[PDB]
Amino acid sequence: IEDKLEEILSXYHIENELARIKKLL
Amino acid sequence: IEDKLEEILSXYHIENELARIKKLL
Amino acid sequence: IEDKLEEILSXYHIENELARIKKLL
Amino acid sequence: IEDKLEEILSXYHIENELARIKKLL
């Protein structure tokens, strides 16, 4: 389990990419 | 652990930014 | 806790909005 | 519960779609 939460935390990137997209607009 | 879920909840922002992107289109 | 996972599941929407964005492009 | 984390892991796609969006810009 503490494992599955670690793999979920593997979301920061999603954020980063959203920011990048905004920059692209 | 209750900790790792707190850091995952640190997603609301992802939503917000998506909405912002839509506004940019 | 089972609670914090319920609030995390409150991501489907993120998907939906991404799809919508694509449609906007 | 290990179940709710499995359904949360059902985020990889979110990533993929973001990448696709970038490609669309």
- A23 conformational bin, left if phi > 0, alpha if psi -120 to 50, beta if neither: alpha
- Provide the residue type at A20 as one letter: R
Interface of A with B in 1-25 (CB under 8 A): 1-2, 5-6, 8-9, 11, 14-15, 18-19, 21-22, 25
Residue A11 CA: distances (Å) to CA of A6, A8, B10, C25 = 11, 7, 9, 24
Round to whole Å and give the CA distance between C24 and B20: 13
Q: Which residues contact B5 (CB under 8 A, 6 or more apart)?
A: A5, C1, C4, C5, C8
Number of C-beta neighbours around residue A11 at 10 A: 19
C-alpha angle with apex B11: B5 to B16, nearest 5 degrees? Answer: 155
Round to whole Å and give the CA distance between D1 and C6: 10
Method: X-ray
Helices (H) and strands (E) in chain D, counts: 2, 0
Q: Which residues contact A4 (CB under 8 A, 6 or more apart)?
A: D2, D5, D6, D9
Looking at the complex, report in whole angstroms how far the Cα of residue B12 sits from the nearest Cα belonging to chain C: 9
Q: Are B1 and C1 in contact (CB under 8 A)?
A: yes
Contact residues, chain D, for A17 at CB < 8 Å: 15, 18-19, 22
DSSP letters spanning B3-22: HHHHHHHTTHHHHHHHHHHH
Q: Where are the domains of chain B?
A: 1-25
Q: Which residues contact D1 (CB under 8 A, 6 or more apart)?
A: A1, C1, C2, C5
Which DSSP letter does residue C17 get? H
Query: Do A14 and D19 lie within an 8 Å CB cutoff?
Result: no
What's this structure's resolution in Å?
2.0
